[PDB]
Amino acid sequence: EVETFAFQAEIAQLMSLIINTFYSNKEIFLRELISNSSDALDKIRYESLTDPSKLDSGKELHINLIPNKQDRTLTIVDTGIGMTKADLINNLGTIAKSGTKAFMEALQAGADISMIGQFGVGFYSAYLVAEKVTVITKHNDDEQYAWESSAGGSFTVRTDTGEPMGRGTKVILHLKEDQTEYLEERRIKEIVKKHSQFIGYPITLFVEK
Numbered sequence: 001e002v003e004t005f006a007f008q009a010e011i012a013q014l015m016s017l018i019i020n021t022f023y024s025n026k027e028i029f030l031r032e033l034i035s036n037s038s039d040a041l042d043k044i045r046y047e048s049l050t051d052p053s054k055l056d057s058g059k060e061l062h063i064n065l066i067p068n069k070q071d072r073t074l075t076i077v078d079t080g081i082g083m084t085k086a087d088l089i090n091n092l093g094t095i096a097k098s099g100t101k102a103f104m105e106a107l108q109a110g111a112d113i114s115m116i117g118q119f120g121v122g123f124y125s126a127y128l129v130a131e132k133v134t135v136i137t138k139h140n141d142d143e144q145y146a147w148e149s150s151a152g153g154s155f156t157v158r159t160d161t162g163e164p165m166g167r168g169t170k171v172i173l174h175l176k177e178d179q180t181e182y183l184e185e186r187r188i189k190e191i192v193k194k195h196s197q198f199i200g201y202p203i204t205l206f207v208e209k
């Protein structure tokens with residue numbers, strides 16, 4: 001049972017702007033997704049400060065980067081607070097309508113695409129490198145759900161019958177054919193060191209056979 005939703009008009013515009021604008025500094029997508037994961041981990045940590053049982057679904061607070069050349073995917077896993085179904089539908093927990101409005105007003109005022117994270121819609125920079133994005137997520141108060149979109153104005157939401165996560169969010173980027181450099185270890189390492197050197201959680205870059 002798959003439900004299909006239309007993006008709000010402003011978010012569909014933001015996505016086609018990211019997909020069609022010529023912009024060479026595509027590596028900022030990883031900084032934005034790691035920063036989103038750090039925010040989600042800060043949230044479950046703060047909640048656990050007054051209620052330790054919120055960590056019953058997993059005490060470790062971390063971020064994993066998993067490249068897979070066979071599937072042409074780069075996956076960013078965090079054990080943060082996760083997202084409910086309502087959150088997923090509501091633009092993955094962001095204020096994406098007013099965020100897009102401020103971002104686009106800033107673009108015409110001298111900003112560039114790399115500043116997207118300052119307007120709360122950094123997740124969508126995933127479409128700088130990915131043709132399709134799958135988000136698997138588990139919040140303590142809800143079941144495990146899968147969100148998916150290849151842009152084009154719509155996304156789907158379904159109950160995820162896959163591997164149980166415990167708690168957190170998994171962003172799977174199905175990379176464009178000419179963006180496979182972001183599957184190479186030394187390239188990911190260079191980008192993490194350049195843009196995410198001070199993240200307060202351990203970032204583990206997995207290797208392949």
Ligand SMILES: CCN1CCN(c2ccccc2CO)CC1
Binds near residue numbers: 080
């Ligand atoms: C402001 C609300 N936050 C909700 C959680 N976030 C998020 C969004 C998209 C994918 C993955 C994650 C977390 O890993 C960051 C934004």
